[PDB]
Amino acid sequence: AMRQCAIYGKGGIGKSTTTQNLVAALAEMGKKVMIVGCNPKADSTRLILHSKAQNTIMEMAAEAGTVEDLELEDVLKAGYGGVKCVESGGPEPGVGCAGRGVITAINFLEEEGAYEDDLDFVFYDVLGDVVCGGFAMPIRENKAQEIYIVCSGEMMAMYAANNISKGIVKYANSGSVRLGGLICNSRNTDREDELIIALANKLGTQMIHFVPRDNVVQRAEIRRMTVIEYDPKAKQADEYRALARKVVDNKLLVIPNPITMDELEELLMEFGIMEVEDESIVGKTAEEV
Amino acid sequence: AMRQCAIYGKGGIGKSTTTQNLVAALAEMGKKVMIVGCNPKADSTRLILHSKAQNTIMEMAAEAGTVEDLELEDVLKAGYGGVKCVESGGPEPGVGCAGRGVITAINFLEEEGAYEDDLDFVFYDVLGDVVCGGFAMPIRENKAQEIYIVCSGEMMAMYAANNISKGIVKYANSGSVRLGGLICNSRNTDREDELIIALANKLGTQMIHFVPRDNVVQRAEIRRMTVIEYDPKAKQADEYRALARKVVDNKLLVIPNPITMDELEELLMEFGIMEVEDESIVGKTAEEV
Numbered sequence: 375a376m377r378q379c380a381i382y383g384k385g386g387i388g389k390s391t392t393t394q395n396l397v398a399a400l401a402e403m404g405k406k407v408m409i410v411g412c413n414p415k416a417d418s419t420r421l422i423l424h425s426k427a428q429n430t431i432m433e434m435a436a437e438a439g440t441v442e443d444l445e446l447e448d449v450l451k452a453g454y455g456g457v458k459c460v461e462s463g464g465p466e467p468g469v470g471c472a473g474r475g476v477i478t479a480i481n482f483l484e485e486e487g488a489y490e491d492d493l494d495f496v497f498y499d500v501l502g503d504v505v506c507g508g509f510a511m512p513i514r515e516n517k518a519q520e521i522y523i524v525c526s527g528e529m530m531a532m533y534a535a536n537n538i539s540k541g542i543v544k545y546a547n548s549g550s551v552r553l554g555g556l557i558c559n560s561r562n563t564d565r566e567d568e569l570i571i572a573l574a575n576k577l578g579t580q581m582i583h584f585v586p587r588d589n590v591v592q593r594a595e596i597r598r599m600t601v602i603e604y605d606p607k608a609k610q611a612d613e614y615r616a617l618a619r620k621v622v623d624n625k626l627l628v629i630p631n632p633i634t635m636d637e638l639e640e641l642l643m644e645f646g647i648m649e650v651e652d653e654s655i656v657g658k659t660a661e662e663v
Numbered sequence: 664a665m666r667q668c669a670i671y672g673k674g675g676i677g678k679s680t681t682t683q684n685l686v687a688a689l690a691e692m693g694k695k696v697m698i699v700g701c702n703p704k705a706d707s708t709r710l711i712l713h714s715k716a717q718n719t720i721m722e723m724a725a726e727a728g729t730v731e732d733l734e735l736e737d738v739l740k741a742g743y744g745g746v747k748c749v750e751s752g753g754p755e756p757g758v759g760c761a762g763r764g765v766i767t768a769i770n771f772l773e774e775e776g777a778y779e780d781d782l783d784f785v786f787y788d789v790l791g792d793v794v795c796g797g798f799a800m801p802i803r804e805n806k807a808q809e810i811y812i813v814c815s816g817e818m819m820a821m822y823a824a825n826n827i828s829k830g831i832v833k834y835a836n837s838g839s840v841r842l843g844g845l846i847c848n849s850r851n852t853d854r855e856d857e858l859i860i861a862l863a864n865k866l867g868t869q870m871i872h873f874v875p876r877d878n879v880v881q882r883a884e885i886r887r888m889t890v891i892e893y894d895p896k897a898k899q900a901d902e903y904r905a906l907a908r909k910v911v912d913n914k915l916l917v918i919p920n921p922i923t924m925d926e927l928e929e930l931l932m933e934f935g936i937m938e939v940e941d942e943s944i945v946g947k948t949a950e951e952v
């Protein structure tokens with residue numbers, strides 16, 4: 375039955391739009407799936423619920439005093455395709471750890487047993503910028519077995535992908551957390567599809583799909599909607615279908631192999647986004663060259 | 664004498680390039696300044712030192728076993744303008760808190776007394792994506808009195824700016840941490856200079872300067888250099904001069920006034936980057952409109 379999935383990736387590469395869409399495309403193949411957003415900002419469940427920003431567990435637990443005083447119907451809410459939704463809340467700015475927000479919401483969902491009710495999939499939307507103990511909480515507490523890293527042909531998204539992968543490495547031994555695959559979200563930078571496959575092979579995983587840059591996306595967004603919900607017929611919808619399909623069919627759950635900075639930098643130079651280091655000119659003024 | 668400064672801001676808006684440059688332009692007016700990078704990645708001191716990536720305290724303390732076994736000359740290193748430099752190191756991926764890395768490096772710098780040696784300024788390069796207790800460590804432990812938030816006319820950078828501001832609010836009472844001003848780093852999106860000044864006034868601070876988009880920057884970067892060091896004569900160098908000047912002359916250290924999501928969203932719509940919400944179409948398919 376059920377699979378415990380989590381999607382990681384750097385901020386602003388389109389982690390939530392890939393997640394919400396493939397989950398809507400998964401639930402177009404009639405799956406009860408649940409999205410749990412771990413991100414400070416409530417942007418991780420909004421497109422399914424046609425909402426602006428779902429209420430978070432840190433918001434509502436402030437209102438009722440504690441988490442047990444929260445009643446599930448107004449915590450977890452369903453939208454398109456009966457896809458269940460919970461935005462967990464960030465840290466109290468400058469003071470709390472992000473981890474806490476995530477853990478209390480897992481516990482509230484195991485406690486009021488929405489985890490064992492019928493669901494074929496659970497998905498955690500998790501930021502991969504800092505891969506600290508806090509954001510690695512679903513990995514540490516063995517709540518996410520299948521990590522799907524969203525990225526693109528750009529240094530920082532790759533860095534992120536690799537550093538998320540070092541965290542899978544540490545909890546390989548303690549549990550069953552394993553990397554599924556990378557998902558390349560096109561930046562329209564030149565031969566990025568190739569680059570991310572190179573990385574995927576150097577880590578020992580696959581670049582499970584290449585999601586394109588489409589305007590479709592922001593057309594659907596003005597309506598606070600998923601692409602799958604706005605126009606079922608655009609090939610963007612069938613991209614997310616190809617991924618949503620490829621996701622359930624995957625049986626490659628490697629225990630990845632992280633690379634050096636230098637090794638990563640190779641990839642970037644080799645595929646043209648990063649330039650090549652001419653050492654002649656280093657440390658030399660407008661004059662000296 | 665000495666001022667304890669920290670520059671916060673979202674990832675990839677150019678927090679480290681603004682910081683390293685204005686610090687090089689501050690040290691062009693002959694100041695002994697020290698940069699301490701708190702970021703996981705060692706990209707926060709590299710342009711001063713003509714290096715690729717300075718060694719971090721978490722890296723070297725792994726080598727010698729503990730922090731006391733570290734000798735200061737190969738921890739803190741100086742580059743252009745006798746500007747002292749220390750990259751503190753990130754969390755061990757998936758396990759550590761970022762906070763720890765920062766705190767051990769403050770303590771090592773107070774312990775081996777580089778804090779009380781001659782310096783007119785100290786600067787902490789700190790990521791503003793997650794404003795959790797970890798990244799708020801120099802604010803919590805009253806090591807940074809003057810927060811300078813770098814941002815731009817874009818939602819997330821603003822969000823960030825505001826949330827960093829909520830953290831200043833919480834430690835207003837306990838200490839002397841106060842917000843200096845915002846710095847707008849041009850994205851070349853249309854009337855962003857105006858937008859960030861609106862925010863600065865709604866927070867009760869000023870948009871201390873508007874740093875432009877220049878190609879100069881990446882020309883200097885191929886040499887692993889600051890703009891101030893590559894061509895002292897470009898008006899980009901005199902922008903950083905205008906900021907480096909404006910920074911020491913500032914005596915506006917407000918205890919900011921954070922805004923609503925809705926209130927922030929106003930700004931964006933009012934200044935044209937965000938659109939306006941037509942509710943007619945919300946939750947309605949390719950067909951229904």
Ligand SMILES: Nc1ncnc2c1ncn2[C@@H]1O[C@H](COP(=O)(O)OP(=O)(O)O)[C@@H](O)[C@H]1O
Binds near residue numbers: 386388559
């Ligand atoms: N495939 C895509 N094509 C075009 N824009 C996209 C695509 N996926 C996401 N985006 C856009 O990128 C921006 C950020 O997306 P988001 O999913 O919110 O990122 P994140 O989760 O990494 O913070 C928004 O404009 C989003 O609609």
Ligand SMILES: Nc1ncnc2c1ncn2[C@@H]1O[C@H](COP(=O)(O)OP(=O)(O)O)[C@@H](O)[C@H]1O
Binds near residue numbers: 673675677848
């Ligand atoms: N004023 C500027 N004009 C143009 N590009 C800039 C400017 N400041 C920074 N950048 C560029 O933005 C990118 C990220 O800068 P960086 O300082 O490394 O960001 P960060 O510290 O927020 O991660 C690099 O191309 C950097 O050179």
Ligand code: SF4
Binds near residue numbers: 504759
């Ligand atoms: S573990 Fe990470 S989320 Fe928690 S306080 Fe540290 S840096 Fe923040």
Ligand SMILES: [Mg+2]
Binds near residue numbers: 415
């Ligand atoms: Mg999000």
Ligand SMILES: [Mg+2]
Binds near residue numbers: 706
């Ligand atoms: Mg940096």
